[PDB]
């Protein structure tokens, strides 16, 4: 698959996020327990709550489509559908909103992804969401200064960075420490205090942000100079226009 046109670093980075054969760079280690705490849906050692009984207990009629489609493990179990949501700064965060939903539907099974300017979300079965979430948090989908895990109060994608280089967060879920240079997650994604903070590693420096970003900007690679990517957008416009007419 081709994924995206263009000849910039931005374009290649958009293709690499979509391509399940591209190995996302891992930047930080986070424990399973700490992913669970950051998600905030259940407590450590709490069994997965259910929304319906396990599939095997349900005795369904013959359906060739269902027989061909393997359910994700949380669907077999009857897990709740829960979410993880991220906000990406327009100051060169590595992932961005449509990059995420496009990538998620190429990489992940059984996924309900939503894109907005200030937040991007995936909803899926809870035990499967915890496995995807580890990857979204540990890899270059995430930077702990320019990306935020935020289930509510998401303002900041379009705000000026603070003096530490951190995105604004009304609820200050991610704190940079002036003396040490690491970010810690001090609250879960909905804003409740964590018993103990989670280290999220060092913010990527400017050079590495520029290497890895998927936003086009005049002070990075401008979209209007990625003339092949603009050509395909314009093509789509014109072909949809003619096809709606006749």
């Amino acid at each position: 698959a081709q994924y995206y046109p263009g000849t910039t670093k931005v374009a290649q980075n958009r293709r690499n996020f979509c391509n399940p054969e591209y190995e996302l760079e891992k930047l930080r280690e986070i424990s399973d327990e700490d992913v669970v705490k950051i998600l905030g849906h259940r407590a450590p050692g709490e069994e997965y709550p259910s929304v319906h009984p396990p599939l095997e207990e349900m005795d369904e009629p013959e359906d060739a489509i269902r027989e061909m489609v393997e359910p994700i493990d949380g669907a077999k179990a009857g897990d709740r559908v829960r979410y993880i949501q991220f906000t990406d700064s327009m100051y060169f965060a590595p992932a961005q909103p449509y990059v995420r939903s496009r990538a998620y539907l190429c990489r992940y099974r059984g996924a309900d992804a939503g894109t907005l300017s200030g937040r991007q979300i995936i909803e899926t079965r809870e035990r499967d969401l915890e496995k995807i979430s580890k990857e979204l948090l540990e890899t270059e989908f995430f930077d702990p200064a320019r990306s935020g895990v935020r289930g509510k109060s998401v303002h900041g994608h379009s705000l000026r960075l603070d003096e530490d280089g951190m995105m604004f967060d009304m609820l200050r879920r991610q704190i940079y420490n002036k003396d040490t240079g690491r970010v810690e997650m001090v609250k879960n994604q909905i804003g409740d205090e964590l018993d103990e903070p989670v280290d999220l590693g060092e913010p990527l420096d400017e050079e590495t942000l520029m290497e890895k970003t998927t936003i086009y900007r005049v002070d990075g690679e401008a979209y209007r100079d990625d003339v092949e990517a603009v050509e395909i957008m314009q093509r789509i416009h014109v072909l949809r226009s003619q096809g709606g007419f006749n």
Partner: protein
């Protein structure tokens, strides 16, 4: 034949039924089974005799929480169902050997009613079904028990609700898959105002059959709206065949190849490869490490992409066994395929746009709800001309129990009555048989 296209037709197990069927043998305008399905859905009513009896015994008539103290009437309607139904049938039929059907279900608690087709051939629309059924059962219940002139208006309220003070039959104990003509968003929309959950309930959650019934209703509405007249006719017929009738086993084979480990993106890659292999698209231009595809048949590219979209919904919401992500599949299948190819997505962007608002109105405070409460007449989901809602039907067929407003919650009366009807329950079977039958008349 106006069109030279032929398609191979399969059953819902992926076995070939008939090869090389002319496209127009699937047209709503020609296929006798689609005619019988559509006249069936015009003429079929579910009567809840238990619900009428209970509303009368408690005087709970006229809509939610409403009650008239002092108006209670205790009538043994379910215990006299056979007689009541026969007397209603005598008023419903036109003649004694016509196609009127009145059949008790549930030990007399429910009745399937099919009002004779001929009442509709001399009617403007379809409201004769609930209105002739309602009065025949109100009169039959009054005559069974000799209900007095002073009390009979309670029987009317228990059967048809607060109408005509309300525009709808508010509080009625009858139900139809269609809704009243005043609720159409535009003229020609009546076959679109059919809840997704009613389609999934009538077809017993068989995914292919739900997708077929939904497609047949949506694309038949496209004819009634004039959308499938002239320039656009072939586009609509090919969407019906490939997205809703599993033509050439395309949907089926995509799901088979992607069901075990697949994603929306893997289904896209397979569909693009199949379109290329079949000659539906070709490389037009090379950019820098990027092939720009073109087509000399936009209706067929649209159809192939539509089959892929249905497969992607089956793979994606089938793997989750949770319908909610159909709004995301409908969006990003189309958004990804345009940047994958350089060609326009299904319905030239209108599935993608329907999916943007459907996603918003299924995950926000402003309106909408869960997938099963939408329909082709809903303001959020009317915009694509038949290519979105059948995927929602497939997704709700595959939902394992994540919805509060599930077909069990919203459509139980519909399910008991309308799934009795073979052509509603298994339309893929009947439409393909009828197409094979008229194969040489096109």
């Amino acid at each position: 034949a106006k069109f030279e296209d032929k398609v191979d037709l399969y059953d819902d197990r992926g076995n070939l039924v008939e090869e090389q069927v002319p496209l127009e043998a699937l047209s709503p305008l020609r296929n006798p089974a689609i005619k019988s399905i559509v006249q069936g859905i015009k003429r079929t009513v579910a009567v809840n005799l238990e619900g009428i009896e209970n509303a009368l015994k408690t005087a709970k008539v006229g809509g939610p929480a409403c009650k008239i103290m002092g108006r209670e009437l205790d009538l043994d309607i379910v215990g006299n169902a056979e007689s009541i139904a026969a007397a209603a049938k005598e008023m419903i039929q036109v003649t004694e050997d016509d196609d009127t059907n009145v059949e008790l279900l549930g030990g007399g608690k429910r009745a399937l009613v099919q009002v004779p087709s001929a009442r509709f051939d001399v009617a403007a629309e379809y409201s004769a079904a609930p209105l002739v059924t309602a009065t025949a059962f109100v009169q039959a219940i009054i005559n069974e028990f000799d209900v007095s002139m002073y009390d009979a208006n309670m029987v009317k309220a228990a059967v048809l609700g607060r109408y005509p003070q309300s525009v709808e039959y508010m509080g009625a104990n009858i139900a139809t898959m269609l809704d009243i003509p005043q609720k159409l968003e535009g003229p020609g929309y009546a076959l679109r105002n059919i809840m997704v959950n009613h389609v999934v309930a009538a077809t017993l959650k068989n995914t292919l059959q739900a997708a077929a019934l939904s497609t047949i209703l949506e694309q038949t509405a496209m004819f009634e709206m004039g959308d499938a007249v002239g320039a656009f006719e072939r586009m609509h017929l090919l969407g019906l065949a490939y997205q809703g009738m599993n033509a050439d086993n395309l949907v089926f084979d995509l799901v088979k190849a992607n069901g075990k480990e697949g994603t929306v993106g893997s289904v896209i890659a397979d569909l693009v490869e199949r379109a290329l292999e079949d000659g539906v698209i070709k490389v037009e231009k090379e950019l820098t490490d990027y092939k720009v595809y073109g087509t000399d048949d936009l209706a067929m590219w649209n159809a192939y992409a539509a089959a892929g979209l249905m497969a992607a919904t089956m793979v994606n919401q089938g793997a989750a066994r949770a319908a909610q992500g159909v709004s995301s599949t409908l969006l990003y299948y189309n958004d990804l395929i345009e940047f994958e190819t350089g060609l326009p997505s299904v319905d030239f962007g209108k599935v993608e746009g329907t999916a943007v608002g459907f996603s918003f109105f299924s995950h926000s405070i402003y309106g909408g709800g869960g997938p099963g409460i939408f329909n082709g007449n809903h303001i959020v989901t009317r915009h694509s001309k038949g290519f979105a809602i059948p995927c929602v039907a497939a997704a709700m067929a595959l939902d394992a129990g994540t919805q509060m407003f599930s077909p069990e919650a919203t459509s139980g009366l519909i399910k008991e009555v309308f799934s009795q009807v073979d052509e509603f329950r298994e339309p893929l079977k009947y439409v393909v048989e009828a197409a094979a039958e008229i194969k040489n008349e096109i």
